[PDB]
Amino acid sequence: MGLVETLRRFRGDVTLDPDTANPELILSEDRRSVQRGDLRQALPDSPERFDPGPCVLGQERFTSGRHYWEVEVGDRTSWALGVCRENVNRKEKGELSAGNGFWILVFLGSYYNSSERALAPLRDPPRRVGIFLDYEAGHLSFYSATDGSLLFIFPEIPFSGTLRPLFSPLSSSPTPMTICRPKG
Structure with a gap:
């Protein structure tokens, strides 16, 4: 029970x-x-729906201030999290990149190093990811919420207009990706 466990109550x-x-x-x-899943569902289409990008947005709209949120991903070795401009092309067929208004951390595999007999894994994958946005600082950074390690920080981003939180489970898995409710 230290400062990081207490300040996580700002999520x-x-x-x-x-x-x-x-x-x-x-x-x-x-x-x-x-x-x-592995099935394309019959849903009403519109410009607002990501296709073919395997994404969903949060209802929340960031135009200023500091925002922290946590996502349980569990055993997953494949996910993308971050934010995008409200006005991105949601029908984008190529890469979802900073240049097109997508600021996302993508976990696509694991690192190992050569050891005495074999290969050693570097770290347990994070089960819980914290995302921090500081709009005026142009700051977006990602953490392993359980141990408080930095995963990634973008270079200063010249945010303009509305941002949306973005979520992308990149594989089929019995493990849902879950947004952690605020404490209390």
Whole structure:
């Protein structure tokens, strides 16, 4: 029980916007969990829905200030988390890159190093990821919430207009990606 456990009580709520979700994604009834299946569902289409990008947005809109949120990913060795401009091309077929208004951390595999007999894994993958946004500082950074390690920090970003939190479970898995509710 140290300062980092206490300050994590600043984590805010995020609820997913079902109208933005790629048609392979399912959402929980409380809109805090998302899972990727292997089936394209029959959903009403619109410009707001990610296709073919396997993403969903939070309902929340960032225009200023400091924002922290936590996502349980569990055993996953594949996910993407961060933020994007409200006005991105949600039908983008190529890479979702900083140049097109996507600021996302992507976990696509694991590192090992050569050891005495074999290979050693570097670290347990994070089960819980914290995302920190400081709009005026142009700051976006990602942490392993359980041990407080930095995963990634973007270079200073010249944010303008509205940002949305972005979630992307990159594999099918029995493990939903879950937004952690605020404490109390």
